[PDB]
């Protein structure tokens, strides 16, 4: 899996492949790994284990509904649940979420982390690949945000054997 997001000129793009890999075989090539939340105003993309990724996503969803969708807050809250005292299941996955305000990735171990400055984020096994690509592009091409993402994923898929070509790019007007 590869999930990368780029943010530039009022545009926020978060897209990823669609391959579900069981061991060294392919479950299904088409899979929506990036989806919409909060009436469709905040973008999400999950990585890791199908099970734990989904259960991570859902938990982030409850928080939003509970905090006027205020992203950043919602995140730190969820993170808190792992830092309390009773170590929760500890989902092995990762989420890249963003909206009109900011971008942010959240591990299922208990932390929220922010982008360098290039507003580039990428999780998954192919992440770093798509990262490099975008981390490049951005620094050398006025390519759109909904464009860099599209090309970066592809660059990855042609490298990560667990990352295919059936993408899904959800942007945020």
């Amino acid at each position: 899996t590869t999930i990368v997001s780029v943010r530039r000129n009022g545009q926020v793009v978060v897209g990823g492949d669609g391959q579900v890999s069981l061991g060294n075989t392919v479950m299904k090539g088409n899979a929506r790994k990036v989806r919409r939340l909060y009436n469709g105003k905040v973008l999400a993309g999950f990585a890791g284990g199908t099970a734990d990724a989904f259960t991570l996503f859902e938990l982030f969803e409850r928080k939003l509904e509970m905090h006027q969708g205020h992203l950043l807050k919602s995140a730190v809250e969820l993170a808190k649940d792992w830092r309390t005292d009773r170590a929760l299941r500890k989902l092995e996955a990762m989420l890249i979420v963003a909206d009109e305000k900011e971008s942010l990735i959240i591990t299922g171990i208990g932390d929220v982390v922010q982008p360098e400055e290039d507003q580039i984020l990428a999780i998954g096994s192919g992440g770093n690949y798509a990262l490099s690509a975008a981390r490049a592009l951005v620094e050398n091409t006025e390519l759109s945000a909904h464009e860099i993402v599209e090309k970066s994923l592809r660059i990855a898929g042609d490298i990560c054997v667990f990352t295919n070509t059936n993408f899904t790019i959800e942007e945020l007007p």
Binding site: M66, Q68, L72, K73, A75, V76, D111, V112
Partner: protein, 299 residues
């Protein structure tokens, strides 16, 4: 012998700004009490209330309507938090024994036309306890007889209004026996800046109407300026958004955080008049408080 579904609305239309569907919903429900009862021998007892499920956020009025309709209906009102029961009958038939208490003890009234408000019902869903009170309430809703120190009172014709934000839970999560007894489902809407302005002056005894009448006791005369009201409102809406949205109670804050000064020294101002304009308001409400750095948790 009582207002019409049109007239009742207008009666709430005073004390409450917005929330048409909700105002309307209860408007019908209360007319019926009058429609049935006008009916004959068997049908007067056969027709049952069409209880409501209000769905909306904090301080948008889901309770005022209920409390006000009851007042314009001179009917035995009572509110209870659905969660009160998360953990002589049991503690739940009490909602009637209590209602009858406040009701005075006149059963011929409690039964015939009392109203019950179950706040936070969206809160006892989906954990083996919360999903018990649904069951605990059924008798209450579906028609039950309950003992009280004044006599036997049956919930056959009591009107039930239940609220909720149902942000996480949908009403579809209630137990089916209940979804079936909360037929009518209205949806109050959150409140806006333009709304606040309205609540701020329009209703009977609006916040401004109140502070004004109070200062008038010390022998002071205050006058709120549109432009000021507008700001007070923009203010409320702001913080509700930026921090913890508490609905319209927020006006009760911005209002008191502003009237502090006059409220204190108003005793030593007999004779004067005070004008609350923008420049004033703008100066009683700082701008933003506490570093509010939520970064100390982020990497």
């Amino acid at each position: 012998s009582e207002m019409t579904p049109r007239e009742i609305v207008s009666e709430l239309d005073q004390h409450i700004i917005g929330q048409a569907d909700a105002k309307r919903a209860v408007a019908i429900a209360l007319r019926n009490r009058w429609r049935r009862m006008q009916l004959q021998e068997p049908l007067r007892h056969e027709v049952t209330p069409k209880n409501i499920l209000m769905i909306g956020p904090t301080g948008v009025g889901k309770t005022e309507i209920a409390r006000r309709l009851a007042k314009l209906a001179n009917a035995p009102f009572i509110k209870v938090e659905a969660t009160k029961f998360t953990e002589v009958g049991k503690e739940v038939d009490s909602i009637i024994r209590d209602l009858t208490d406040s009701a005075g003890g006149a059963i011929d009234a409690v039964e015939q036309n009392g109203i019950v408000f179950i706040d936070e019902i969206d809160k006892i869903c989906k954990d083996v306890s919360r999903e018990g009170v649904q069951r605990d309430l059924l008798p209450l809703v579906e028609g039950s007889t309950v003992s009280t120190k004044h006599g036997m009172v049956k919930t056959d014709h009591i009107l039930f209004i239940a609220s909720g934000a149902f942000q996480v839970a949908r009403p579809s999560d209630l137990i089916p026996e209940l979804q079936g007894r909360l037929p009518i489902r209205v949806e109050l809407t959150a409140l806006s800046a333009a709304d606040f302005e309205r609540i701020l002056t329009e209703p009977h005894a609006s916040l401004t109407e109140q502070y004004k009448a109070l200062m008038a006791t010390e022998g002071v005369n205050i006058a709120f300026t549109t432009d000021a009201v507008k700001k007070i409102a923009e203010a409320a809406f702001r913080v509700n958004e930026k921090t913890e949205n508490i609905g319209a109670r927020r006006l009760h804050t911005v209002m008191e955080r502003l009237m502090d000064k006059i409220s204190f020294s108003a005793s030593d101002m007999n004779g004067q008049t005070v004008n609350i304009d923008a420049a004033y308001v703008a100066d009683a409400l700082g701008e933003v408080v506490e570093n509010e750095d939520l970064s100390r948790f982020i990497l």
